[PDB]
From Swiss-Prot:
Acetyl-CoA binds at residues 119-132, 155-164. The modification N6-acetyllysine is found at K52, K141. This is Alpha-tubulin N-acetyltransferase 1. Changing Q54A: Loss of acetyltransferase activity. The lineage of its organism: Eukaryota, Metazoa, Chordata, Craniata, Vertebrata. Signal peptide: none annotated. It is found in: Cytoplasm; Membrane, Clathrin-coated pit; Cell junction, Focal adhesion; Cell projection, Axon. The gene is ATAT1. Changing D103A: Reduced activity.
Amino acid sequence: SMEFPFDVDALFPERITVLDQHLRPPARTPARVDLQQQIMTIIDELGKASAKAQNLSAPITSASRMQSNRHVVYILKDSSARAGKGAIIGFIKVGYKKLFVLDDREAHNEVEPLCILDFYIHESVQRHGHGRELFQYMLQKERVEPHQLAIDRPSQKLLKFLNKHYNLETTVPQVNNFVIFEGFFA
Ligand SMILES: CC(C)(COP(=O)(O)OP(=O)(O)OC[C@H]1O[C@@H](n2cnc3c(N)ncnc32)[C@H](O)[C@@H]1OP(=O)(O)O)[C@@H](O)C(=O)NCCC(=O)NCCS
């Protein structure tokens, strides 16, 4: 898992930490502005590792993008003992987006669903249930059911994940790089 030049455990007391555009350090020695920079470094590095895994020319997640857009990230820290300064396992980034979405009749619909915009679990610990734990937490906090989500450019791994954990299989064909499932328009 990803290690940093600072104490991750002190920075993030909870196993899953929710952050928005304000990048607020969880409550409660280092100055607030310095804690905020630590958070920014974490988000930047997570964004980079995700991008490299998805073969992207540039990250779609970074600290600066987070603030200027108004997206929300959920960050899962490592529960095992790695030195002793803690570590980060992965994250999921969500946000509402206005989209034109095709239905089963091939008509375009104006909608604004919650979208899964980025999602990454460290390669070394994938397939150990971390992705499900993070996803479940996000669902409970965001108050949405899985079939109401739009998924941005999902990988084959993520499609298999959604079918396994949430029985999401049947898609409604789109032209815009988002994926939606049957029941989205329900
Ligand atoms: C997608 C991802 C977040 C899944 O998280 P995870 O912690 O591996 O997921 P979990 O352990 O909770 O769930 C495991 C299930 O996910 C799916 N999955 C995970 N890794 C997989 C792989 N290498 N091949 C096929 N399916 C996979 C499978 O359905 C798997 O179930 P199985 O092991 O019974 O086949 C993680 O694989 C990842 O970071 N992938 C790279 C980034 C990415 O693809 N993001 C999606 C585009 S935004």
